[PDB]
């Protein structure tokens, strides 16, 4: 309960009179109450690392012992709140202090202790019902979209002897008093869970449903699933926040720059979404974790664990969370400097030896689960990491030890950026290992797409092993089946994998229109191949350069598929246009032969 500072030495504090102190448990160092973490016991002393600036901490300062490690507050009031990497609400320290600064040792509640929430019990409990860890006993109308479900803590069970009457409550009163055998206890409306502990589940279901990202590339050739893990080495993350099939977004910037973090907090309360014809601010179904590089280095490493623990909490209600964890490589640079303070031996380029263990302890909390509780729920957490290598390599220990863990790699390069292509998709080092899990969704609902996806990845590959000779030799003595797979292959690279994100046709790409565009482009490839191979020996052998001059008006309708608006036009107004065009592609070849 009481320690004393025996000696500080930089951000590491040695405390005495700490006999029963646990590892990684929280302490309040100093007279200003700096939050710390016990990292090394030696007998009755306790080496503490301080989560704040240590200047002015004398010896003989009191060290309060709490009994609980670094943990977040879970409850109603989270959605819309701007937190820190140790969950300090930055939109309320700016009010209760009325300054531009974060003073040392602030103790602001992470959830507000003044807002009255409308409690609604689950109408199937009573005074004398049996309830165990995970059973929903309340519903809070947090805002219009989120039905905030109150849940029992895991490893807590018994019989209810007090349920709270439906009304309006704050997050401090005693809403639930169930009893275990002999001992009565009390539950509030907020719960507290340690950020390095996995929130428990019943079973981990396979991730078999596609995460609809709003784009044409990355959703046909390299698909992601609900419950999957990606890597992006803001137009891919802002697109998922408006249109995708996720009900809670969690944006976690670990060590991002100050002006690029003040950019996002300016932009998200202006964004809108389309729910039922009404427009709604997207800051009703997201919560950010703001963290810059001026912040404590101990609160930058913990921002990833706070972000996924917040992400796992809204999973258990039954929502499908999608967490974007921006700048994973900044998070590893927080692991490099903690390990240097401990005098830990580095393994690879100064990074600790456990860089892969900590990343697999974060990326493997994603996935579709069967949620712990009574009403048979099902939620999921998608994690979208973002490695920033030192100039686009797989040599650093952060980029290469992410690709040994994740399943999707949305591999981007810097050379393929000045084409004004936008995205900077590479499609040679980018993969997706959710092609075998999605062989049931594609074959049942879409039943045609896997052989077109097999061909369309091949046409863009045969172009590569031609293009080195097309540069050096230059199209002089070439076969005519290769001129198909350079002009049809060019038609893909400007009309299928080409985007521009502020336009009224290319901010959402629905998937039935996405397979509708490839249903014509592969058919034009195979009919150009079947023409050139059966008319290779008989009489009046043709090349490509007699077709593209003759069928110049066919190559305009096959190039004006990306410019049809998916938003103004009808749902069936776009497939018939792609089904009428096929008979302008089946009859058109029968005008040459």
């Amino acid at each position: 309960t009481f320690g004393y500072v025996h000696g500080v030495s930089g951000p590491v504090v040695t405390a005495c009179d700490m006999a029963g102190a646990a590892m990684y448990e929280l302490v309040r160092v100093g007279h200003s109450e700096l939050v710390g973490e016990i990292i090394r016991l030696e007998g009755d002393m306790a080496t503490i690392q301080v989560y704040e600036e240590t200047s002015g901490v004398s010896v003989g300062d009191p060290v309060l012992r709490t009994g609980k490690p670094l943990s977040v507050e879970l409850g109603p009031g989270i959605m819309g709140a701007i937190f820190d990497g140790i969950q300090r609400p930055l939109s309320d320290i700016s009010s209760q202090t009325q300054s531009i600064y974060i003073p040392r040792g602030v103790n602001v509640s992470a959830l507000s202790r003044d807002v009255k929430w409308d409690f609604t019990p689950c109408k199937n409990l009573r005074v004398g019902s049996h309830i165990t860890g995970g059973d929903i006993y309340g519903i809070v109308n947090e805002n219009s979209l989120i039905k905030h479900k109150i849940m029992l803590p895991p490893r807590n069970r018994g019989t209810v002897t007090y349920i709270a009457p439906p009304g309006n409550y704050d997050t401090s009163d005693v809403v639930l008093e169930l009893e275990f055998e002999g001992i009565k206890e009390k539950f509030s409306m907020v719960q507290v869970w340690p950020v390095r502990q996995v929130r428990p589940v019943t079973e981990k279901l396979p991730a078999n449903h596609p995460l609809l990202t709003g784009q044409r590339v990355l959703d046909a050739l390299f698909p992601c699933v609900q419950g999957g893990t990606t890597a992006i080495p803001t137009v891919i993350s802002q697109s998922l926040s408006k249109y995708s099939n996720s009900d809670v977004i969690i944006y976690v910037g670990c060590g991002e720059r100050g002006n690029e973090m003040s950019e996002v907090l300016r932009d998200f309360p202006e964004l809108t979404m389309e729910v039922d014809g009404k427009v709604e601010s997207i800051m009703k179904r997201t919560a950010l974790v703001a963290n810059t590089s001026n912040m404590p280095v101990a609160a930058r490493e913990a921002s990833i664990y706070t972000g996924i623990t917040l992400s796992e909490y809204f999973r258990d209600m039954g929502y499908h969370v999608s967490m974007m964890a921006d700048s994973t490589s900044r998070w590893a640079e927080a692991l490099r400097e903690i390990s240097g303070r401990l005098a830990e031996m580095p393994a690879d380029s100064g990074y600790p030896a456990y860089l892969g263990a900590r990343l697999a302890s974060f990326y493997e909390r994603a996935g579709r689960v069967k949620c712990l509780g009574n009403p048979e729920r099902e939620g999921s957490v998608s994690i979208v990491g973002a490695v920033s290598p030192p100039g686009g390599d797989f040599s650093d220990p952060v980029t290469s030890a992410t690709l040994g863990i994740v399943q999707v790699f949305w591999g981007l390069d810097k050379k393929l950026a000045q084409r004004k292509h936008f995205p900077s998709v590479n499609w040679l080092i980018s993969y997706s290992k959710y092609m075998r899990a999605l062989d049931e969704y594609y074959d049942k609902h879409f039943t045609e797409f896997v052989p077109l996806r097999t061909k369309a990845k091949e046409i863009l590959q045969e172009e590569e092993d031609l293009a080195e000779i097309v540069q050096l030799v230059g199209k002089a003595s070439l076969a005519e089946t290769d001129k198909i797979t350079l002009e049809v292959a060019k038609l893909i690279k400007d009309d299928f994998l080409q985007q521009n994100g502020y336009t009224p046709y290319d901010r959402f790409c629905p998937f039935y229109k996405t397979v509708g565009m490839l249903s014509n482009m592969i058919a034009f490839y195979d009919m150009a191949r079947r023409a050139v191979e059966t008319t290779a020996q008989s009489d009046n052998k043709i090349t490509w350069s007699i077709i593209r001059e003759h069928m110049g008006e066919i190559l305009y309708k096959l190039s004006s598929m990306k410019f049809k608006d998916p938003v103004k036009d009808g749902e069936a107004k776009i497939k018939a246009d792609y089904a009428q065009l096929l008979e302008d592609m089946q009859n058109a070849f029968r005008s040459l032969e």
């Binding site: 380029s349 030192p390 100039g391 390599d393 040599s395 650093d396 080195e468 000779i469 050096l472 030799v473």
Partner: protein
Amino acid sequence: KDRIEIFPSRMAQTIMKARLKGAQTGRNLLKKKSDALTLRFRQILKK
């Protein structure tokens, strides 16, 4: 003239392994493009 100016690091080892490998693929073209042109060059002397 004897070294390309870069400083020794782990990343700068993979870039000078790629540029060496990205040069051996250029020479492999030009080693056989000359002989493919020499394949036609003997036939003109054989004509």
